[PDB]
Amino acid sequence: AGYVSQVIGPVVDVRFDGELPSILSSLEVEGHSVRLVLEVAQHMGDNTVRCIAMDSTDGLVRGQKVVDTGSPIKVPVGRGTLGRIMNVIGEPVDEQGPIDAADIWSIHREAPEFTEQSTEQEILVTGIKVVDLLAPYQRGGKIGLFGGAGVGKTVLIMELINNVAKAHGGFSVFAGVGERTREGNDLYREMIESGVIKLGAERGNSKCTLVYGQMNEPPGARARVALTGLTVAEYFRDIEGQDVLLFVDNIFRFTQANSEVSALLGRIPSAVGYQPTLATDLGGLQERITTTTKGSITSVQAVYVPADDLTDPAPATTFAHLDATTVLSRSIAELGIYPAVDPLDSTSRMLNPNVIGAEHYNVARGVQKVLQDYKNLQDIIAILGMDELSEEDKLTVARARKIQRFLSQPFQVAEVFTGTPGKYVDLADTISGFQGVLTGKYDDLPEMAFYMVGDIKEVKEKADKMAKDIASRKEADNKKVSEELKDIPSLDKLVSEIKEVVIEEDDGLEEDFKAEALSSETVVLNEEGKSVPLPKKN
């Protein structure tokens, strides 16, 4: 009912002789290589709408028919999306059939209004000790994850998915906003490997819906894929009544994508370079993540800080919405502590005694003060000597050295390659455990007693095994037989056991090759449209 009038990059003008589609409505370009969905951005006047494409616009002709769907982009939602991968417009890209839709929901939505909000401000127990104690998660809050590579971020993602599905019975959505396809495939196969995504007939027992808008997609597709993950999460909140987890992977890439679609629609950029609507384009996403009266959505958003500058407007606008940070550190991970949460740079708004109580608040502030007190004398130990200062200073060294161990915890999705069984730790057990180490009831137990264990009745069994291990050492000796002729042969024997592989100097490359003949003449279309040589006169 409408036809393409302008194609300028990813930005398509469509003309409607009848009535116009609404802003944010979805339009299908009828007749194309792939499914080309446009989203109406503005009404330009003269019966033209201005749209932003969700796929490539190369191959688009002015006058191509465009069908208005009468609604915004509509995605399949429900339990049938679990363990599937969707793109922004709802198509399955995991190549495992269609998506069993419970409903087909519009991705564009107003935030849950004032009467629906929760005034309670309670804590989301996650089963991770360092996360539950020092930087708790608000049920319905937004949590910034300052991880990276090699700090065990993906294991923490899959464990929040696992522990929230195990404890509270809620499902998870992962919105891969603008992620590389190698990283997205790595996370997919690592979720299949860890059992939070199951393929085939066991597909219903998956805990996670992946919504992937990749980095090679146009800016309109990366700018809207977080809303698709939000819609999948809002179905579980509003219909299933669950405590959902949403993972917006790199909220900065959401910001950068919306900045690109604001630049492409010809809007004047605001401060440093961002979209003029940066606070509202971010708040439109973040205000739909809340606690309703039905359930909640808790959002764990990875935050990239642009030039290591926290006063840049994209992290300064994001940090207004965040309720907790969990900074994952490389220096924590190079002490073998997993999860690699920095126990001192992670913050939470939920850490005050009016929401968690004075018991939990004072235990957390004591633990944080003890680790801080150890932290600002390590330039006094390494300079002047280990046993140089007082015994009370070395008492805080030993207590913080064993609390710094005690924050580590074995993870249930990590047991398929580490062997050590993962241990969910409850909140009251975490409080009662760290209070005991803080007063000094465990000053006699070793420092390796507090390592990769669930709660306080496991550090005792760890030390019990370590002191049964004293009596298991006199069972044998240590020796290495046959100093020069156990299995170490002559080097000619070692080169005469390696097998020669086949190398050929015909490299081939003509295996299933067409070998068309390319014309050197330039071939154009005449006015009838047939392939004709160039008319040889200017």
């Binding site: 004032f114 003029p276 606070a279 509202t280």
Partner: protein, 71 residues
């Protein structure tokens, strides 16, 4: 809340509503100023009303000045 009016244009709301909400609350508190009573008004994050007004101005294509603000 027996004595408080609570005007809210939250982060999801349109930037015209966030630009206008301190003026709405000021008109509500000027009722108490104008009839002899005393009012207290708290504009929480007037730095966000300025950002909403900057959004409105750059979407109206007015020339940005310092930091991008309309002048």
């Amino acid at each position: 809340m027996r004595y408080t009016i609570m005007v809210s244009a939250t982060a999801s709301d349109a930037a015209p509503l966030q630009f206008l909400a301190p003026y709405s609350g000021c008109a509500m508190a000027e009722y108490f100023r104008d009839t002899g009573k005393h009012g207290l008004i708290i504009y929480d994050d007037l730095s966000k009303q300025s950002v909403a007004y900057r959004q409105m101005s750059l979407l109206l294509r007015r020339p940005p000045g310092r930091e991008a603000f309309p002048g």
